[PDB]
Amino acid sequence: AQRVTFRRRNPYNTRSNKIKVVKTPGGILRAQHVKKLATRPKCGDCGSALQGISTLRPRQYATVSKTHKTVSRAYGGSRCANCVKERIIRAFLIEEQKIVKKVVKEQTEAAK
Amino acid sequence: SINQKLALVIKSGKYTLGYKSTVKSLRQGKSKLIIIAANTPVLRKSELEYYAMLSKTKVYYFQGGNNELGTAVGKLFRVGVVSILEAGDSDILTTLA
Amino acid sequence: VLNMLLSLDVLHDYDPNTKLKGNVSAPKLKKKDRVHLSKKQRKARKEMQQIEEEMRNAEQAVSAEERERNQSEILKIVFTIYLNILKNNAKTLIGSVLEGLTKFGNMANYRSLRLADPLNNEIIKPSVNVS
Amino acid sequence: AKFLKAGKVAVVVRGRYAGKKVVIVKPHDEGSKSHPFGHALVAGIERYPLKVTKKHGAKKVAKRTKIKPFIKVVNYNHLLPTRYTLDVEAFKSVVSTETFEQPSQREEAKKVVKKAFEERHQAGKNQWFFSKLRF
Amino acid sequence: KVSKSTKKFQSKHLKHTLDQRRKEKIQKKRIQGRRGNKTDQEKADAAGTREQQQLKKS
Ligand SMILES: [Zn+2]
> How many Å is the Cα radius of gyration of chain D?
15
Q: Nearest C-alpha of chain A: how many angstroms from C4?
A: 53
Helix (H) or strand (E) holding B66: helix B66-73
Whole-angstrom distance, CA of residue D43 vs CA of residue D102: 17
Please state whether A8 falls in left (phi above 0), alpha (psi between -120 and 50) or beta.
beta
Find the helix packing angle between E14-32 and E4-12, rounded to 10°. 60
The β-bridge partners of D9 are D23
Q: Is residue C76 helix, strand or coil? A: helix
| Amino acid symbol at E46 | A
Whole-angstrom distance, CA of residue D25 vs CA of residue A27: 72
Q: What are phi and psi of D27, to 5 degrees?
A: -80, 140
Q: Is residue D116 helix, strand or coil? A: helix
Domain ranges across chain A: 1-37, 38-112
| Amino acid symbol at E2 | V
What is the CA(B82)–ligand 1 centre distance, in A?
A: 29
C-alpha A14: how far from chain center: 26
Cβ burial, residue C62 (10 Å; 0-12/13-18/19+): exposed
Chain B residues in contact with D3 by the CB 8 A cut-off are 27, 29, 54-55
The approach used to solve this structure was cryo-EM
What does the DSSP 8-state code read for residue A42?
B
In order of A36, A73, B6, C34, C82, the CA distances from C104 in angstroms are 71, 76, 68, 52, 11
What is the CA(A43)–ligand 1 centre distance, in A?
A: 5
Whether B54 and D81 lie within 8 Å, measured CB to CB: yes
The β-bridge partners of D72 are D42
Q: Nearest C-alpha of chain B: how many angstroms from D51?
A: 31
Number of structural domains chain D divides into: 1
Whole-angstrom distance, CA of residue D72 vs CA of residue D11: 12
Find the helix packing angle between B66-73 and B3-12, rounded to 10°. 50
Q: Is residue B16 helix, strand or coil? A: strand
DSSP strand E in D60-112: where? 68-75, 79-85
The β-bridge partners of D27 are D40
Cβ burial, residue A84 (10 Å; 0-12/13-18/19+): buried
What does the DSSP 8-state code read for residue C34?
P
User: Which of A72, A73, A92 is nearest residue D133 as measured by Cβ atoms?
Assistant: A92
Resolution rounded to one decimal, in angstroms: 3.1
Whole-angstrom distance, CA of residue D23 vs CA of residue D44: 6
Chain B residues in contact with A96 by the CB 8 A cut-off are 50
Domain that holds residue D52: 1-135
What is the CA(D118)–ligand 1 centre distance, in A?
A: 36
With touching defined as 3 or more inter-chain CB pairs under 8 Å, the answer for chains C and E is yes
Cβ burial, residue E22 (10 Å; 0-12/13-18/19+): exposed
Whether D18 and A84 lie within 8 Å, measured CB to CB: yes
With touching defined as 3 or more inter-chain CB pairs under 8 Å, the answer for chains B and D is yes
| Amino acid symbol at A7 | R
Chain D residues in contact with A85 by the CB 8 A cut-off are 13-14, 18
Chain E residues in contact with C120 by the CB 8 A cut-off are 54
Whole-angstrom distance, CA of residue A22 vs CA of residue A34: 12
The residues on A that touch C, with CB distances below 8 Å, are 44-47
| D9, D86 contact by CB (below 8 A) | yes
DSSP strand E in chain B: where? 14-17, 33-36, 58-61, 81-86
Whether E47 and C18 lie within 8 Å, measured CB to CB: yes
CB pairs under 8 A between B and D: 21
Cβ burial, residue C75 (10 Å; 0-12/13-18/19+): middle
Q: Which chains touch E (3 or more CB pairs under 8 A)?
A: C
Rounded to 5°, the CA angle A15-A21-A23 comes to 155
β-bridge pairing B58-61 and A29-34 = unpaired
Whether B28 and D83 lie within 8 Å, measured CB to CB: no
**B88: CB partners within 8 A, 6+ apart:** B8, B9, B12, B13, B14
| B21, D22 contact by CB (below 8 A) | no
